[model samples]
Structure formats: structure tokens, C-alpha cells
Target: TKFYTDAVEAVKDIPNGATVLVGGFGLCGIPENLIGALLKTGVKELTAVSNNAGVDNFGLGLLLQSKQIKRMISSYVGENAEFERQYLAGELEVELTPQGTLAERIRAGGAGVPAFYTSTGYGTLVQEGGSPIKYNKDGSIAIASKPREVREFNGQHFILEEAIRGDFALVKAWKADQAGNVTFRKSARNFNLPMCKAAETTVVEVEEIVDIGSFAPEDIHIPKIYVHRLVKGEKYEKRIERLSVRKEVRERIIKRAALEFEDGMYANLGIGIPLLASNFISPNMTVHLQSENGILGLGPYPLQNEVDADLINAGKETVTVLPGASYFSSDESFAMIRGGHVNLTMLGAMQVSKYGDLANWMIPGKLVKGMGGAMDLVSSAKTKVVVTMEHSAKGNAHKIMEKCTLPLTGKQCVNRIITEKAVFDVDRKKGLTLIELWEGLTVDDIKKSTGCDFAVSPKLIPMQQVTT
Candidate 1:
């Protein structure tokens, strides 16, 4: 009984208004069985610290449905409509942390640190709290996020984020032993490891429980001392979010990415078309791939026989690791971005205004953005932000615009934009000027499909085909 218990009893002691750190990356390694048991209990007014609120039907979405959760400190909640409804209705408190910021906040808490400085949210609403978080029915501000303390280091700004100490930490592991010694398979270890120590009480639910010494000393990710209790997750759905909506990768659009892939670049890729750019990268070219889910130095999509189920991207897509690949917690990942360790970041956006403003998260009344690493990457002057999207969205709605109609992810953040029609460099005064355009696409043709006015560079030339 000291080591194992029913999921309900495992969480029976958690009281109301208690902060709970739940671990998962988009439900990949979520403890659904434990969450289900927690929901059956009477715990109310819970403050959830997580990377995301799960989809509407599952994961944290179930908690949001019962109306038990009072606040969420999460990076994104795009999948859950109920979260939006509650926040918009002034029924929930939301603190949108940058993906890396939240991960570090949890880890720093486990280390008994009170707060730390991070550069992720500087020069943005996250530092000032002026931007609206929720609105009244009349569209007035209902609940606005509070600003963080700002400090400077070596003439650089870093917003201070407080460490989070929670009441209970619920996490999922691939396997563990009676001693509470644990190991995780792949990307599932992303947030769960830090969470194990970030709370007063940590409960882990695993798929399999093995002997005390089942894992090698070096193989143990988290020692048993950190785990207070354990429960066997009866089963797991390993539910996945929607895959890319765009299926066809145009030849011209795919080829131009190679020109951007230079030697010794640390680049973060967005989920959709940006993922395709990896395929065209030269074999001799060595590039470090970073994901918002807290993975870096990724290689490529492994073949079926070679694939490791645990390794995946921020988008939850299965991926392979390079020989030099190393893993770090989410805080380290964002620190790498904001600290100027990243050279370039490529994203798939819904809109990019003429002056380099980016809006890739939300889609009006359709879907609220989860607000992943986009804000952080766009905010970082150390990284060159590249946007890769179709010139026109579905039904030929020009994604390039005079000004983004959708909510802004970052203001004047984009550096260069790549699309099926052309690749344009952003300018503060002159605006988007075409540097690379596909053959047969004229200035008028580009102007017709584009909502924003653009200039054609004298260097405007056809995108070269992939010779191989």
C-alpha cells in the first residue's frame, strides 16, 4: 500500500483550491486514468499548471467540462473550446506562459527556487499585461493577465517568472518499479520529469511496473525519492491531435527551403510545411532542429522499422534523432531561443502582414490558438523568423495581407516569408519585396492573389528545381 494504490485513493487527499501539476505533451503521455479518478472525486477550484489543456473531449478537457478547474497556467489551450468559453465568460483564470517558461518554472520550483529571469516574453504584452486575456460579453476586458517584473542583464531584458509549487503532481511514465524509480520512453519525458519534483506530493501512473533494479543506474530518469506514490494506468489512448491540414507539398515551395538551410544553423521548424523542408535539406548539411515541445537536435522522420515511438516534435509528430541529438527540459529549450542560441525559426502561419507582423495561432471564431512557441520565437531578436504558408489559404483567401485581420502572434517579427507563390524579405520601410518567385508567376499574378501590396526586387528570379 505504501507504493501502490487505486487512482481514486491516490488523489483522495488533494483538497480544493490546490494547485496541481499535470504532465503531458498534448496527451501523448497524459495520465488519463488518474485524471479520470481525480474527476470522480470532489476536488474543486483546482489550479492546473500544464503545457496545454487537452482537447475538449479528453485529458484536461474532461476537467474543464466538470467545471472543477478555476485557473490554468498553460502555454496553449487551442484544442479546448470550453476553455475559451469559460475564459471569455469570465469563469476561468488563465496565465499563458511561454512553452519553455512554464517548463522552467516547474523545474525551478522543484529546486526550491522562488523565481528566475527569462527572455521569452520581453517587449510583449506578457511583460506589460495590457493585452486582453478574456473579454466580457460586451467585448470589454474581463480578466487580464498580470504583468511580470522586468530586469536587465548585460543590457538585455529578461522577464522574471515565479517558480510554481503545486499541491500534487500527476504524471505518466512508461514504466516504473515498486521503489518508485521511473523511466520514460521518448518525448513523454518532456514535462513529467520536472513535475515529479515540482510539487509537494507527486503521484505517477505507469503502464508497466517492473522489479526494483529493472533499469540500469544511468537509465533511471527520476529516482524513487521524488515519487510519493504510484498507480498503474490501466490503458492509454495515446490520442493525437489533428495532423497537417495541407497534404500537397508543391515542388517550388519545397525546393526553396534548401537555399535557407545553411551550414551550422540552429533552426526551429513549425508543424506543417516547415516539416517538409527537412526532407529537402542536404545530407551533408548539419542543422539542429528544435521543437516547441522541448526537443532539439532532431534529425528526420524515421522509417517504420527505425522509428522510436517516444521521440516526437512539438506537434506530436513522430521524429528521429541525430547522432549529436541531446534532450533538455522545456525551459532550456526556450532559453536556447531567447538567449540567442537559435539562428532561425521557420513557422507555418495563417497570415503575415506586409511589414512582418505575424498571425499564425487563431482562426477567428473557428479555433483559438494554443499560443505555443510562436510568441517566444517571434519575440526573440536573436532568431530570424521565417513563415512558410500557402500564398492563399483555402478558397484562395490571400494569407499575405495589408494587415493581419486575425489576432497577432507577434508584431513586426517575421524576417523572411516563404510560400508556394514566392519568397519575400520583410522591410520596415519598403515592405515585402519578392526575392524569389516561381516561374510563370508575374507581379500582377502575385498582386492578384496577395492581399498586401508588394514590390518586385530586380533580383527576383525563378525558384530553382531540386536537381536530385
Candidate 2:
């Protein structure tokens, strides 16, 4: 039961062609050292399972670059260009899983649930070419047809799905004791813990190695029982998936945030301009930044050389974390989001109604993706603010409107709106009333760009603090 060894040494026994489960959401918390060792060993023909293939040149991505992996089981694959090329050219095998379903399957497998039913992939390509069964009134299924075609029965449809398991589970941890007890930091915990138990052999790499009893039992996220091998290293590289910059006035935005962020505030950063607010946190103020994938206690961006392919943010780009951070399951992570544990949530928006209705999840054209955790955060977070560009990049289009054309994430969840041109507060009695406007821009100017009517507040104040 006590198999202790370095990550590289432990992975040496893995053959050239093996099925591996590498734990990560994008590149976050991947077993980089173990993967590097596997690369050095020139292992090939890997059937890899993870959230997404890492970026083109890093993380599990390196294996793809080296032409090592033969098959992939994942949800999102758009970020890596190499994955697309190989897949399109008929060079790689791909088995796509619904994001929610994949996460549940991994968790279920680790929890010994064997198999469970989900409505996630009930239709579309996920169900195509697979056997379909009809469920009766008691949830019992009668096989309707073979693989090619399906017949309608009692009005319920179902598919039989098998569980997924792996030979080796590779994961990254924030710290580990010499005894192999692992603790993950933030969003890095998403896929790592369940993967540790789902595989026959699990190897963990950590930023620091401590004595067996150094960490408190309550702080332990992943127990030592599931981890078999451990390796210690220093310096990690964390990358940001999307680099959204706000062209609007920055100082006023900071001032607005200052009103709420007292000394210690747990905050969630939404995509786009709101993400930049992290740069404005006052010194001595402790702001725990949360991403939907379940990371907190995030530090500033990483240094240059330490940039590992494995470290990343919720956007799925590489990112680093401060010490003493802890990781947990996706369900637990969402629980923190839904439980009102966070002090404030700063998000971006495509459209905001006067009554504070917010919509940011989907665009009308495509069925690409849905709101992941924005709904939960907006509904449950103690305070919510939105930061976005005043208008779309198309020059004449305005983002602020009477009603949103996109789907609503939450009804009346927004508290305030910060745009490049003005600041508005959602007034339930009156539609969106302007609280403040830029120095030179007039209310008429804003109305010209916006397709909706704008009412200036009687208490409208002149903008004093604007940043270039």
C-alpha cells in the first residue's frame, strides 16, 4: 500500500501504448512532471481522457504535438489547433462527451456508481449511431433496435452507456506530504480527485512536499489513500485562456468596486472587462478570485520561465496559484458558488435591461455553449456588478438595451452596470436610468447608439474620475 517514488520514476513503467486518464480542466492541474517523463520515455498510442486537450504546444497538447496520443475522450476541443488538424486529417480518434455528462461519469466512476442515466446527450451526434432503447413506466428499458435505427415505444427514449476507466491517472496537486496525501488548489481540483480514484494507478505531482502530518485534516481535499506516487517541484506556470481588455474608463470602475471590497472579500470574475478588476485590488485587501470551474485564492499572473503547459485558469489557459490553496469536486465547487459564500461577482454582459435583467450566456446564431455557472453566481452571490463595452465592435451597435435578444441567465440579478460611456443602476420602478455619463458624451449621444430609450436620473451626477 505504501508505494513512494518520484513522478518520473513512477511513470517509467508505463509502456509505449497505454490508456491514461490525465486530470485537468484545460491545462489546469495536469500532472506535468509525469507527462514530461512520459514524453521523455517516448510513450505512444495513448488513449487519453480529460476535459479538453491542452493548448497546442503544452500540457496534454505536447503529446499531440509529439504524435504520441492516438485517441481522445473530451468535451471542449476548440482551443487546440493541432487537435483540429489531426482530427480533420483522419490522424486521430475522437470520442466527444457532453461536458456535464463527462464530469458526472468521472465522478460516478470514482464513487462506484457503475453507470447512471443522463439527459445531457439524449439527442444530436452524441446519440447518433448508438443503440437506443425505450423505457417503460417503471424506467425499465426494452431494446427497440440495433445500432443503426431506433423504434418508438412507450414515449420514452434512452441509450445504454458504458463506464470509462483508465490504467494510469495523472494529476497535479498544490502540496503533498511525503506519504502521498495530495491537496489541489482552486479549479485545479475539478477533474483530479475523481480521476485519482478511477484509475488503477495514480501519480501526483505537487509544488511543495511536506511531512505527513503538516496539513490539517479538515483542509485535506484528496486523501493519501487514493494517491500512489508523489513528486515535488518548484515554480508553476499559469496561463489565461482569454485576454479581455476594457477600453473604458478604469479609475471609476475601481472606485465603484472600492465601495464594496472592504478588507477581505471573496469575489467572482466574469469573462471580458470585469476580469480586469483584479488589477485594481488594494494592497492589504484579500480578494479570493473564483472561477466557475471552482478555483479560489488565485494570485497574480505567473512569471515567464515558470510557465508550464499544465497551469491555467477557468478560461482553460494556463494559470498559477498562491500557496495554501485547496481543491475539491465540481459539485462542491458549485456549492460554494450557489451558497452565497462569495462576497461579490463581477461579470460581463451582452445586454442588460433597465430592470437589471442580465443576459450573457448565448448568442442567437449558434447553439455553441450555455451558461455554466453564471446563473448560479448571479442568483446567489451577495452582490453582483457587470462590466462591459458600451457597444459591440460593429461600431453602431449598442449593448445596453431595453431587453436582451439573448437568453437570460437570471431575472433581475444585476445590481449595477459599468460601460465605456456611462454607469447605470437598475431601477425596478423605472427602466434603466443613467446614473453617470462620460465627460464629453451627451445623453442624446448614448441614445443614438442604443436602440432603446434612455432616461437620465434626476440625481444624475457628472463623471469626475475617468481613466484612459
Candidates in order have lDDT scores of: 0.79, 0.64
- Candidate 2 lDDT over 1-468, as tens digits, reads 244455567787776667788877766777777778788888899988876787887778889999999877776666788876676555666665544455566666677777755323333234453211222333232322232123333443434445667788887778887677778875677778777877778777788888889889887778888887776743466554544222325555554544445467778776545555576566766777766565677665556654544445566544556665554565455557655677778777778776766776545323223344555566542555554544443776667777776666555667777776677776645667777877788888778766566678898876534221
- Output the number of the lDDT-best candidate: 1
Query: Among all windows of ten consecutive residues in candidate 1, which has the lowest summed lDDT?
Result: 242-251
What's the residue-level lDDT of 249 in candidate 1? 48
Estimated TM-score per prediction? 0.84, 0.62
> Over the stretch 1-468, how does candidate 1's per-residue lDDT look in tens digits?
145658888999999999999988787678888789878996899999988888887888888899989888888887688888887777877777777778878989999889998766665566777445666776566777788899998776778988988999999888887778988766777788889989999999998999988999888888888998889887787775643222224556666665677778988888767767777777787888877666778876666655454567787666667787777656667767767678888888889999988887665445545567777877676788888877898898888998888767776778898887888999856789998878887878888898888888998888665544
Off by over 4 Å in 1: 81-91, 130-140, 240-251, 284-286, 297-309, 320-326, 353-355, 363-367, 391-407, 427-434, 440-460
Residue 56 of model 1: what lDDT?
89
lDDT of 2 at 364: 30
Residue-level lDDT for 42 in candidate 2: 86
